[PDB]
Design an enzyme around this catalytic site. Sequence first.
Site, PDB file in Angstrom:
ATOM      1  N   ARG A  10       0.805  -1.215   0.000  1.00 40.27           N
ATOM      2  CA  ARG A  10       0.000   0.000   0.000  1.00 40.27           C
ATOM      3  C   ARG A  10       0.841   1.269   0.000  1.00 40.27           C
ATOM      4  NH1 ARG A  10      -1.563   3.172   4.134  1.00 40.27           N
ATOM      5  NH2 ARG A  10      -1.040   1.595   5.715  1.00 40.27           N
ATOM      6  N   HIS A  12       4.335   1.530  -0.713  1.00 38.40           N
ATOM      7  CA  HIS A  12       5.399   1.626  -1.701  1.00 38.40           C
ATOM      8  C   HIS A  12       5.237   1.084  -3.112  1.00 38.40           C
ATOM      9  CE1 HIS A  12       7.524   3.146   1.731  1.00 38.40           C
ATOM     10  NE2 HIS A  12       7.315   2.020   2.391  1.00 38.40           N
ATOM     11  N   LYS A  41       2.186  12.000   6.174  1.00 40.83           N
ATOM     12  CA  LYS A  41       3.390  11.194   6.308  1.00 40.83           C
ATOM     13  C   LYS A  41       4.461  12.077   5.666  1.00 40.83           C
ATOM     14  CE  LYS A  41       5.182   6.539   5.518  1.00 40.83           C
ATOM     15  NZ  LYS A  41       6.508   6.858   4.925  1.00 40.83           N
ATOM     16  N   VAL A  43       7.736  11.542   4.556  1.00 41.69           N
ATOM     17  CA  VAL A  43       8.466  11.025   3.401  1.00 41.69           C
ATOM     18  C   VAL A  43       7.964   9.648   2.987  1.00 41.69           C
ATOM     19  CG1 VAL A  43      10.732  10.365   2.523  1.00 41.69           C
ATOM     20  CG2 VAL A  43      10.518  12.283   4.120  1.00 41.69           C
ATOM     21  N   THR A  45       8.421   6.689  -0.522  1.00 43.08           N
ATOM     22  CA  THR A  45       8.885   6.332  -1.856  1.00 43.08           C
ATOM     23  C   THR A  45       7.959   5.314  -2.514  1.00 43.08           C
ATOM     24  OG1 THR A  45      11.186   6.639  -1.147  1.00 43.08           O
ATOM     25  CG2 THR A  45      10.814   5.439  -3.203  1.00 43.08           C
ATOM     26  N   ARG A  85       7.915  13.984  -0.659  1.00 36.48           N
ATOM     27  CA  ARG A  85       8.269  14.634   0.595  1.00 36.48           C
ATOM     28  C   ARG A  85       7.485  15.919   0.806  1.00 36.48           C
ATOM     29  NH1 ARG A  85      13.811  13.489   3.181  1.00 36.48           N
ATOM     30  NH2 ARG A  85      14.367  11.459   2.268  1.00 36.48           N
ATOM     31  N   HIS A 119       9.628  -3.402   4.473  1.00 35.87           N
ATOM     32  CA  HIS A 119      10.107  -2.054   4.751  1.00 35.87           C
ATOM     33  C   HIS A 119      10.944  -1.526   3.597  1.00 35.87           C
ATOM     34  CE1 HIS A 119      11.596   1.398   6.960  1.00 35.87           C
ATOM     35  NE2 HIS A 119      12.845   1.009   6.779  1.00 35.87           N
ATOM     36  N   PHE A 120      10.803  -0.237   3.305  1.00 40.45           N
ATOM     37  CA  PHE A 120      11.598   0.387   2.256  1.00 40.45           C
ATOM     38  C   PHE A 120      12.692   1.148   2.995  1.00 40.45           C
ATOM     39  CE2 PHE A 120      12.036   1.717  -2.137  1.00 40.45           C
ATOM     40  CZ  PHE A 120      12.885   2.813  -2.018  1.00 40.45           C
ATOM     41  N   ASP A 121      13.933   0.699   2.848  1.00 42.71           N
ATOM     42  CA  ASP A 121      15.041   1.330   3.558  1.00 42.71           C
ATOM     43  C   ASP A 121      15.630   2.560   2.877  1.00 42.71           C
ATOM     44  OD1 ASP A 121      16.511   0.909   6.067  1.00 42.71           O
ATOM     45  OD2 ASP A 121      18.276   0.743   4.768  1.00 42.71           O
TER      46      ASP A 121
END
EC number: 4.6.1.18
Length: 124
Positions: A10, A12, A41, A43, A45, A85, A119-121
């Site tokens: 959802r 990314h 939110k 930030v 990606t 952002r 998770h998107f690092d």
Amino acid sequence: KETAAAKFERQHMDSSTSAASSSNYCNQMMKSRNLTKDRCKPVNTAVHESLADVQAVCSQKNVACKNGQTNCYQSYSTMSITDCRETGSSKYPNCAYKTTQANKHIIVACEGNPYVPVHFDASV
């Protein structure tokens, strides 16, 4: 409660968009994916590749995560992504985002069975 894998999708995944670089892309995307409901939110990606291609990253280059964990993976290829952002004029409930499209490697944290992104690092 949303599963970790579903939350990653959802937040990314946006495989179909044809306006990844549009100045208004992020405002629309962040709202539609419910990332501006209770607050903005800061930030986020979005990856513009198939779900299969992003899930495949969990079997690619194993690298350290920003937090020190060792369950992160970096995509061998570059992928189309859009960084969203908050701008200076952004103020809930009137969230405002800058849209920055790029083509580079993504790094995601993976877990579970199936072993998928949770998770998107970061992107490189």
